[PDB]
Amino acid sequence: ALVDSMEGVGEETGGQIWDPLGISEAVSDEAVMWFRASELKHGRVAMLASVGYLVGAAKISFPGELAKGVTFASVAANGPYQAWDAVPQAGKLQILSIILALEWATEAKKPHYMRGGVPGKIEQLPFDGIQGLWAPKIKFWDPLNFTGALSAEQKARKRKAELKNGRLAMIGIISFITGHNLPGSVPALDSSF
Amino acid sequence: SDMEGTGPETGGKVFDPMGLSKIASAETLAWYRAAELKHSRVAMAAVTGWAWVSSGGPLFPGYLSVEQGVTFESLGRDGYAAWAAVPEAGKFQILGVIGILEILSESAVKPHYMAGGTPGKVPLLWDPLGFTAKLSPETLARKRLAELKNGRLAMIGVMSLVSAHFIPNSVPLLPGS
Amino acid sequence: VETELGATGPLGYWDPFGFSVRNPERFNRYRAVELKHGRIAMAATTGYMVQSFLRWPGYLSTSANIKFADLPNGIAAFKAIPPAGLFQILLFIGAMEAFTWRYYEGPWPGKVPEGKAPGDVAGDLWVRYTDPEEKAFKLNAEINNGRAAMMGSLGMLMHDHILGTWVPPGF
Amino acid sequence: KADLEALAKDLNPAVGFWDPLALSDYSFWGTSQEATIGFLREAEIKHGRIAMAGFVGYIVHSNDIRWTFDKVAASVPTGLPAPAVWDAIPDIAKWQIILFVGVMESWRENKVVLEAEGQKHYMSGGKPGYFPSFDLLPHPVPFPLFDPFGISKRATEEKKAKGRLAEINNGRLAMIGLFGFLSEATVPGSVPFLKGVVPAYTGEVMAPFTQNIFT
Amino acid sequence: SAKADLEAFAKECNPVVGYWDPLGLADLPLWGQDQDAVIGWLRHSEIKHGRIAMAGFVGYIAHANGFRFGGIGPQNVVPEGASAPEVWDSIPFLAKLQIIGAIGVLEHISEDKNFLAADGMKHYMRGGKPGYFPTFSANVHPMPLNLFDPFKWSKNASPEKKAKGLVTETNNGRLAMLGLFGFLSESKIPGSVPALSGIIPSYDGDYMQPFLPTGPDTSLWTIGNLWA
Ligand code: CLA
Ligand code: CLA
Ligand code: CLA
Ligand code: CLA
Ligand SMILES: CCCCCC(=O)OC\C(C=C=C1C(C)(C)C[C@H](OC(C)=O)C[C@@]1(C)O)=C/C=C/C(C)=C/C=C/C=C(C)/C=C/C=C(\C)C(=O)C[C@@]12O[C@]1(C)C[C@@H](O)CC2(C)C
Ligand SMILES: CCCCCC(=O)OC\C(C=C=C1C(C)(C)C[C@H](OC(C)=O)C[C@@]1(C)O)=C/C=C/C(C)=C/C=C/C=C(C)/C=C/C=C(\C)C(=O)C[C@@]12O[C@]1(C)C[C@@H](O)CC2(C)C
Ligand SMILES: CC(=O)O[C@H]1CC(C)(C)C(=C=C/C(C)=C/C=C/C(C)=C/C=C/C=C(C)/C=C/C=C(\C)C(=O)C[C@@]23O[C@]2(C)C[C@@H](O)CC3(C)C)[C@](C)(O)C1
Ligand SMILES: CC(=O)O[C@H]1CC(C)(C)C(=C=C/C(C)=C/C=C/C(C)=C/C=C/C=C(C)/C=C/C=C(\C)C(=O)C[C@@]23O[C@]2(C)C[C@@H](O)CC3(C)C)[C@](C)(O)C1
Ligand SMILES: CC(=O)O[C@H]1CC(C)(C)C(=C=C/C(C)=C/C=C/C(C)=C/C=C/C=C(C)/C=C/C=C(\C)C(=O)C[C@@]23O[C@]2(C)C[C@@H](O)CC3(C)C)[C@](C)(O)C1
Ligand code: KC2
Q: What is the DSSP string of A2-69?
A: -SSSSS---TTTTTS---SS--TTTS-HHHHHHHHHHHHHHHHHHHHHHHHHHHHHTT-PPSSEEETT
Beta carbons of C22 and A28 less than 8 Å apart: yes
What residues contact residue A158 under an 8 Å CB cut-off, 6+ apart? A147, A150
Whole-angstrom CA distances from A91 to A51, B23, E108 are 20, 35, 50
CA distances from D211 to A187, D72, D207 (A): 12, 19, 9
- For chain D, what is the radius of gyration of the CA atoms? 20
Distances (CA, A) of E32 to D17, D136, D137, E35: 45, 11, 12, 9
Residue nearest to atom 12 of ligand 7 (CA): A168
Question: Residue D162 and residue B17: Cα distance in Å, rounded?
Answer: 54
| Residue count of chain C | 171
Q: Which alpha helices (H) appear in C98-163, and where do they start and end?
A: 132-162
What is the Cα–Cα distance from D41 to D123, expressed in whole angstroms?
Answer: 9
Distance, in Å, from the CA atom of C146 to the CA atom of C152, rounded to the nearest integer, reads 10
Question: Which sign, positive or negative, has the C-alpha torsion B153, B157, B159, B164?
Answer: positive
Instruction: Give rounded-to-5 percent helix, strand, coil for chain A.
Output: 45, 5, 55
Task: Judge contact between A136 and B106, C-beta under 8 A.
Answer: yes
Q: Which ligand is nearest to the CA of D145?
A: 3
| Residue A162 near residue A156, CB atoms below 8 Å | no
Q: Is C15 within 8 Å of C41 (Cβ atoms)?
A: no
By the CB < 8 Å criterion, does A154 face chain B? no
Residue E74: Cβ-neighbour burial (10 angstroms; 0-12, 13-18, 19+): buried
**DSSP element (H, E) containing A71:** strand A70-71
CA dist., res. A8 & res. A28, Å (int): 17
DSSP 8-class letter at C99 = I
Q: Residue window 28-57, chain E: list those with CB within 8 Å of chain D.
A: 28-32
- Cα(B72)–Cα(B59) distance, integer angstroms: 7
The Cα diameter of chain A in Å comes to: 56
If we measure between CA atoms, which residue out of A19, E129, A128 comes closest to residue A8? A19
Q: Whose CA is nearest to atom 1 of ligand 1?
A: A39
In chain C, breaks (C-N over 2.5 A) are found after none
Q: Is E172 annotated as a binding residue?
A: yes
In SS3 terms, D93-125 reads as: HHHHHHHHHHHHHHHHCCHHHHHHHCCCCCCCC
Count of CA atoms in the C-beta half-sphere (13 A) of C152: 19
Q: How many Cβ atoms sit within 10 Å of the Cβ of residue B97? A: 10
Q: Which phi and psi (to 5°) does residue A70 adopt?
A: -125, 120
CA distance D28 to A138: 59
**D74-80: long-range contacts (C-beta < 8 A, 24 or more apart)?**
D80/D185, D80/D199, D80/D200, D80/D201
**Angstrom resolution of this structure:** 2.8
* CA gap D61, D85 in Å, rounded: 7
Which of A124, A144, A155 to mutate: most B Cβ within 10 Å? A144
> What's the distance, CA A71 to chain centroid?
27
| Residues of D engaging E, defined by a Cβ cutoff of 8 Å | 140, 142-143, 149-150, 153
d(CA C119, CA C139): 11
CB D84 within 8 A of CB D76: yes
Question: Which residue's CA is minimally distant from atom 10 of ligand 7?
Answer: A168
Integer distance in angstroms from the first to the last C-alpha of chain B? 42
| C159 known ligand binder | no
Q: Which atom of ligand 7 is nearest to the CA of A163?
A: 3
Residues of B in contact with A137 (CB under 8 A): 112, 115
Contact indicator for A13, A20 with CB cutoff of 8 Å: no
CA distances from A46 to A60, A118, A120, C30 (A): 19, 21, 15, 35
Measure the N-to-C terminal CA separation of chain A; round to a whole number of Å. 40
Provide the terminal-to-terminal Cα distance of chain D, rounded to the nearest Å. Answer: 39
CB-CB neighbours of A179 under 10 Å: 18
Identify which of D92, D111, D213 has the shortest CB distance to residue A15.
Answer: D111
What contacts D25, CB < 8 A, 6 or more positions away? D2, D33, D36
In this structure, are residues A48 and A54 in contact, taking their beta carbons and an 8 Å threshold?
no
Experiment type: cryo-EM
Angle, in degrees to the nearest 10, between helices E2-13 and E159-186? 70
| Residue type for position B89 | A
Selection from D91, D206, D210 nearest residue A186 by Cα = D91
Using the atom order of ligand 6, give the atom closest to the CA of residue E223: 22
CA distance D208 to C10: 60
Q: Do A187 and D92 touch (CB under 8 A)?
A: yes
**Do residue D140 and residue E22 have CB atoms under 8 angstroms apart?**
no
Give the amino acid at D24.
S
List the single residue in E with minimal CA-CA distance to B13.
Answer: E114
Atom 35 of ligand 9, nearest CA residue: E165
Whole-angstrom CA distances from B172 to A45, A62, A70, C132 are 46, 29, 37, 101
Angle at C51 between CA C47 and CA C52, to 5 degrees: 125
Cβ atoms C170, C58 nearer than 8 A: no
Q: How many helices (H) and strands (E) does chain E have?
A: 5, 0
Residues forming beta bridges with residue B174, ordered by sequence position: none
CA distance A61 to A55: 8
Best to test chain C binding among A21, A28, A114 (most C CBs inside 10 Å): A28
Q: Give CA–CA dist A104/A95, Å, rounded.
A: 14
Residue nearest to atom 36 of ligand 9 (CA): E165
Number of CB pairs, chain A paired with chain C, less than 8 A apart: 19
Structural contact between residues D168 and D45, judged by C-beta atoms closer than 8 angstroms: yes
Ligand 1: distance of its center to the CA of A35 in Å?
8
The DSSP annotation for E44-72 comes to HHHHHHHHHHHHHHHHHHHHHH-----SS
Question: Do residue A187 and residue D110 have CB atoms under 8 angstroms apart?
Answer: no
Q: State the Cα–Cα distance between residues D67 and D78, nearest whole angstrom.
A: 15
What 3-state class would DSSP assign to C67? Answer: strand
Q: Confirm or deny that E46 is annotated as ligand binding.
A: yes
Q: What is the Cα–Cα distance from C101 to C36, expressed in whole angstroms?
A: 10
Query: Which residue owns the Cα nearest ligand 7 atom 47?
Result: A12
CA distance B102 to B122: 9
Interface mutation vs chain E, best among D68, D137, D147, D149, most E CBs within 10 Å: D149
Q: How far apart are CA B130 and CA A143, in angstroms?
A: 35
> What is the C-alpha separation between B79 and B53, in angstroms, rounded?
8
Question: Ligand 2 centre from A62 Cα, in Å?
Answer: 9
The rounded distance, in Å, linking the Cα atoms of C107 and D116 is 39
First to last CA, chain E: 59
Q: Which residues pair with A70 in a beta bridge?
A: A67
Q: Are E187 and E203 in contact (CB under 8 A)?
A: yes
Say if B63 is an interface residue toward chain A (CB within 8 Å). Answer: no
| Nearby residues of A46 by Cβ (< 8 Å), 6 or more positions away | A166, A169, A170, A172, A173
How far apart are the C-alpha atoms of B172 and E94, rounded to whole Å?
11
Q: How big is the CA angle at A152 (ends A146 and A155), to the nearest 5 degrees?
A: 50
Using an 8 Å Cβ cutoff, are E190 and E202 in contact? yes
Q: Which residue of C has its CA nearest to A32?
A: C17
Q: Which of A144, A143, A142 is nearest to A162 (CA)?
A: A142
The Cα of E180 is separated from the nearest Cα of chain B by a number of Å equal to 35
